[PDB]
Every structure is written in structure tokens, then in C-alpha cells.
Design a protein around this nucleic acid. Structure first.
Ligand SMILES: Nc1ccn([C@H]2C[C@H](O)[C@@H](COP(=O)(O)NP(=O)(O)OP(=O)(O)O)O2)c(=O)n1
Ligand SMILES: [Mg+2]
Ligand SMILES: [Mg+2]
Length: 342
DNA sequence: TCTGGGGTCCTAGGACCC
DNA sequence: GGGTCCTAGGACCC
């Protein structure tokens, strides 16, 4: 019993919406992120800017060093959110079985759909179309019998394209598929696997599951499965937010508690308004805080607590500030809450 | 050039329970 | 000693 999964992905999502709305931004390098002086990074960039080597999650310092004409934008989340909602409604026209992964992404299970002669390919294509219509933005797609494979597929013919992997193509596909392409294998893991000669799924198929479990625990099992092409992960649609936090990095490190306090004062209303949106009584399971120093180490203090309370956060933030700052500078203050379990 | 902010999931020791 | 809650931290993703 094979399934039909479609990963839809908006390309250069933030950038795209900026360009739709401002056509002057179209053929010149632009990016969303914090400024040089604000210690910020790039959220995303448009394709003119990628040309120069500008990637997401990358320090704006490096970004301008690479592309001095870069246009920096602060970004408008309601605009992106509005787009998101729209594209999710568009998904809803084709299935209910929809698992968003973020603003711009979603898994669809279309197996039991009778829309386009059960053609997942025509479904994805009809979805990329109608998204370009009524939004004037561009989406890419990947079709596969499972989640991860559809995900890797969605970035194969981007921008403005889609890629299908049938079960017959799968084994061939996995052979040369590098482990780092698998979602959940970042830099560190990739580096351990390389260090033991593992680069592609091909390489792990020849490995022993026992040893892989000994070395990576449950992550080994995951690897092994994904390598065999196995991904029994069901598309969900029922998933819910488990937590919420608000954090900030200042332009210069701060050294006095008064300043840390001054930060918390400004962060709390934010955290409150945001939590109210989904929990008007403000009733939480745990709250707590977060500092990160100059030596970038990051500590968090969080405890059980009935309802978002400002002074407690201030208190525990002072404890934290004393009991483990050892004279280091501080670059970010952050508040956090863990929502109740329903 | 020097490292966001919003999240998820996983691990692991002690506490606590049986 | 096996669950499970508590807290801290790390790797990962968008
Ligand atoms: N590290 C990251 C990665 C993505 N993002 C945001 C900005 C992007 O517009 C958005 C979409 O995620 P993404 O698909 O990884 N990025 P983007 O859509 O630009 O990549 P492509 O799909 O265009 O290749 O998430 C971020 O803020 N920080
Ligand atoms: Mg994406
Ligand atoms: Mg995208």
C-alpha cells in the first residue's frame, strides 16, 4: 500500500512577497534580515542576491561583504502570514490532510483524493498554478510515496517547478542521495557520519542497524529507515503549538542588571499579547527565561508556573544573571512559556 | 564577517512513585 | 529497576 505525498514550498518566500508588492525590488539583490550594526542575520534572500552567495541563517556582516549593494529589509510578517493562510485555504480545496511545517511549507496526503484522476502530479501542478494566480507568487513541489522523499523532491526543480519520485525510482534515487539532504541531519551529524565514511544512503544500507543504534540511538534507526526509503510518518493536520517565547539580541553586549531589567520590561508586554491570542486567561504550564553570553553559551531557567507572571520572570532572570554570568557580556535576553498539555 | 527569532524533538540525571 | 515528571541543554528546521 503506497501513499501519495506532496510537499509544497514557496520559493524565496519573504523575498517573493516583497517583490510582488514592490516591483522595483525585482531584478536587484535584496534580503530580509537585521542590520550589520544590529548584529542581525539574513532570513532569506532573492535570487539576484543568492548569485553573490547570500544564504539564510547567515550573518548580515558576511552578507554585505559578499554583496555590498544588498538591499536590507526588516520584513512584514502579516503580509507573509496572509499569504500563508491563503495557500492553506488553496490546499484545503484539494484535501483536508494538510500538515503545515511553517508559513511557506505544507505536506499534503492526496492518496484518497479523487480530484485530478488521482494524479498527485496534476494535483501539485494545479496547486502551483492557482497559487501563482490570485497571489502572484511562485511555489515549488515534490511528489513521493513518503514525507522526506517529497521534501527532498520539492527543492530539485525550484524555483517554479516540481519533481516526482515514483516507488520504482526510489532505490536508484537513494543510492547517491547524500545523508545531509535528509531533513534532521544538520552539520554535526553529517560530520560524524562522514568521519566514519558515511556520505550517502547507499553507504548506510551496507551498515548494521545494531551498531547504528549503539552510536546514534533512535536517530540511527531514523537514518537506517530513511536510507531504506522507509518513512511511515503519517501526515498529521492535528498538530498544535506547544510553547511560545520572545527574545532579543541588543546591538552591544550589556553588562549591568539594570540594563537586563530594562530589556525584560520591553519583552513582557510582547509575550503577553502573543499568549493572549491563543490563551486569554494567560494560563500556562511553565514559564522561564533565557540569556546568552559573549562566549555564546546559552542558559535557560524554566519552572512550573500557573500563569504568565512578569515579576517572577524578572526574579528568575536576576537569579540567572547572578548565578551564572561569571562576568561575561550578554547579547540576548529572552522570555519563554510552555503551554498546557491539551 | 561573527553569528535572529520562532519553534520542534531528543537526551539524561534526580526526584518521586511502585 | 521501570515509568514519568522536572529541568537544562543540544541539534535541527524555517
Ligand atoms: N534559517 C531560516 C530559514 C528560513 N527562514 C524564513 C525566510 C524564508 O522566506 C522562509 C521559507 O523557508 P525556506 O523555504 O527555507 N526559505 P526560502 O523560501 O527562501 O527558500 P527557497 O524555498 O526559496 O529555496 O523561512 C528564516 O527566517 N530563517
Ligand atoms: Mg521552506
Ligand atoms: Mg521555500
Amino acid at each position: 500500500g503506497s501513499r501519495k505525498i506532496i510537499h509544497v514550498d514557496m520559493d524565496c518566500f519573504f523575498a517573493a512577497v516583497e517583490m510582488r508588492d514592490n516591483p522595483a525590488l525585482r531584478d536587484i539583490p535584496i534580503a530580509i534580515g537585521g542590520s550589520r550594526e544590529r548584529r542581525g542575520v539574513i532570513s532569506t534572500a532573492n535570487y539576484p542576491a543568492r548569485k553573490f552567495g547570500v544564504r539564510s541563517a547567515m550573518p548580515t556582516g558576511m552578507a554585505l561583504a559578499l554583496c555590498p549593494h544588498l538591499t536590507l529589509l526588516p520584513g512584514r510578517f502579516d503580509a507573509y502570514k496572509e499569504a500563508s493562510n491563503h495557500i492553506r485555504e488553496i490546499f484545503s480545496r484539494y484535501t483536508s490532510r494538510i500538515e503545515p511545517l511553517s508559513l511557506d511549507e505544507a505536506y499534503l496526503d492526496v492518496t484518497d483524493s479523487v480530484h485530478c484522476h488521482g494524479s498527485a502530479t496534476l494535483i501539485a501542478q494545479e496547486i502551483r498554478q492557482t497559487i501563482f494566480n490570485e497571489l502572484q507568487l511562485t511555489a515549488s513541489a515534490g511528489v513521493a510515496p513518503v514525507k522526506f522523499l517529497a521534501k527532498i523532491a520539492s527543492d530539485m526543480n525550484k524555483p517554479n517547478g516540481q519533481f516526482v519520485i515514483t516507488p520504482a525510482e526510489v532505490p536508484a534515487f537513494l543510492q547517491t542521495l547524500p545523508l545531509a539532504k535528509i531533513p534532521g541531519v544538520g552539520k554535526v551529524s553529517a560530520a560524524k557520519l562522514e568521519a566514519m565514511g558515511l556520505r550517502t544512503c547507499g553507504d548506510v544500507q551496507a551498515c548494521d542497524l545494531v551498531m547504528l543504534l549503539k552510536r546514534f540511538g533512535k536517530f540511527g534507526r531514523i537514518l537506517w529507515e530513511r536510507s531504506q526509503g522507509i518513512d511511515e510518518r503519517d501526515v498529521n493536520s492535528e498538530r498544535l503549538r506547544k510553547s511560545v517565547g520572545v527574545e532579543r539580541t541588543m546591538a552591544e553586549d550589556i553588562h549591568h542588571w539594570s540594563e537586563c531589567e530594562a530589556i525584560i520590561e520591553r519583552l513582557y508586554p510582547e509575550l503577553e499579547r502573543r499568549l493572549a491570542k491563543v490563551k486569554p486567561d494567560l494560563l500556562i504550564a511553565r514559564q522561564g527565561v533565557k540569556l546568552k553570553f559573549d562566549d555564546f553559551q546559552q542558559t535557560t531557567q524554566e519552572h512550573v508556573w500557573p500563569r504568565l507572571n512578569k515579576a517572577d520572570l524578572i526574579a528568575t532572570a536576576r537569579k540567572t544573571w547572578d548565578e551564572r554570568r561569571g562576568g561575561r557580556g550578554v547579547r540576548l535576553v529572552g522570555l519563554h512559556v510552555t503551554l498546557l498539555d491539551p
